Amino acid sequence: GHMRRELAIEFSRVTESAALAGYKWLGRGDKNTADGAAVNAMRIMLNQVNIDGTIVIGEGEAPMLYIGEKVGTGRGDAVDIAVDPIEGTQANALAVLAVGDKGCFLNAPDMYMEKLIVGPGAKGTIDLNLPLADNLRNVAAALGKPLSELTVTILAKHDAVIAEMQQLGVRVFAIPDGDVAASILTCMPDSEVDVLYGIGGAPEGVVSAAVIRALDGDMNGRLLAGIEAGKVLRLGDMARSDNVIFSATGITKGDLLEGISRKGNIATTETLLIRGKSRTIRRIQSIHYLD
């Protein structure tokens, strides 16, 4: 092992660059252009860092940031990398990067995954081998509240989820954020989310698991068609190390970060930089001088 702590700011430059590369193209509505631009910038900046990095979750295999791609000067620590150069469902757009020790992310097939996520206030209360109705009661009691005051947060993406929550007699609130941001919102200190629930891609679930572990929340996943459809994945089965760093930079304004903001010829980025080994959260605002 192991990746060093000092590599944090270096990762924050990567998402700042992706965001700055993408934001105009995304502002013109040219979504494919934004993605290419964000991706390219992410690749260039990852290559200025002294790591021996491997993309393990990313753009597919994509001509760029593909699965198994090598990035970094190739010197220093061996690390695994997950990228999401433009996450979000447009507003609530973020550039996201996660780097950790080799083997830190579970390698899951592009399969569906049922996801139950909580923050630190309800850690250790969940277990997808139990009925969702029981899980929701356990979480409510851990947060010191009646089931009637619990709200299940879901993503806008859906209608079978709302019905299941109607059948369970629980409030539901749909938020406009993507997966990673919603997971992060859930585990931030003083979060207003009680529990987060959904069905989505398994790789994206492993990425959420990595940030939730970093922030000391909790998660289970159930793969839906080591090992197969049906098995319940604990947090530590998906996020396999505490030594991960997450960097997320705002492209447009969302519930978690400000978008890139200009004042005369100065552009300011806002990045959340989460260090799982020390369990810390920073907000970094960088100055960029415009043309």
CB atoms within 10 A of CB 19: 31
Same fold, 1-102+243-291 and 103-242: no
Q: Which residues of 74-107 are buried (b: 16+ CB within 10 A; e: fewer)?
A: eeebbbbbbbbbbbbeeebbbbbbbbbbbebbbe
3-state SS, residue 283: strand
164 is in an annotated binding site: no
Q: Which amino acid is at 192?
A: E
HSE of 68, CA atoms in CB hemisphere, 13 A: 3
Question: For the purposes of burial, counting CB atoms within 10 Å of the CB of 120, is it exposed (0-12), middle (13-18) or buried (19 or more)?
Answer: middle
CATH architecture, domain defined by 1-102+243-291: 2-Layer Sandwich (3.30)
3-state SS, residue 230: coil
237 is in an annotated binding site: no
253 is in an annotated binding site: no
CB atoms within 10 A of CB 158: 11
52 is in an annotated binding site: no
Q: Kindly indicate whether the domain formed by 103-242 is annotated with CATH number 3.40.190.90.
A: yes
In the 8-state DSSP scheme, what is residue 2? -
134 is in an annotated binding site: no
255 is in an annotated binding site: no
186 is in an annotated binding site: no
70 is in an annotated binding site: no
Looking only at the bridges linking them, the beta strands covering 280-289 and 266-275 are antiparallel
3-state SS, residue 231: coil
198 is in an annotated binding site: no
Do residues 22 and 33 lie in contact, with contact meaning Cβ atoms separated by under 8 Å?
Answer: no
84 is in an annotated binding site: yes
77 is in an annotated binding site: no
204 is in an annotated binding site: yes
Structural tokens at position 176: 């406009």
Structure solved via: X-ray
88 is in an annotated binding site: yes
Enter the resolution in angstroms: 2.0
Helices 8-27 and 31-46: crossing angle in degrees, nearest 10, is 160
Structural tokens at position 281: 């959260």
The domain spans of the chain are 1-102+243-291, 103-242
Helix residue ranges, H only, 76-218? 132-142, 159-167, 179-187, 202-214
Cβ-defined contacts of 234-237 (< 8 Å, 24+): 235/209, 237/106
3-state SS, residue 44: helix
Question: For the purposes of burial, counting CB atoms within 10 Å of the CB of 247, is it exposed (0-12), middle (13-18) or buried (19 or more)?
Answer: buried
**Spatial CB neighbours of 60, under 8 Å, sequence gap ≥ 6:** 66, 67
- Where residue 65 falls (left for φ over 0; alpha for ψ -120 to 50; beta otherwise) is left
3-state SS, residue 8: helix
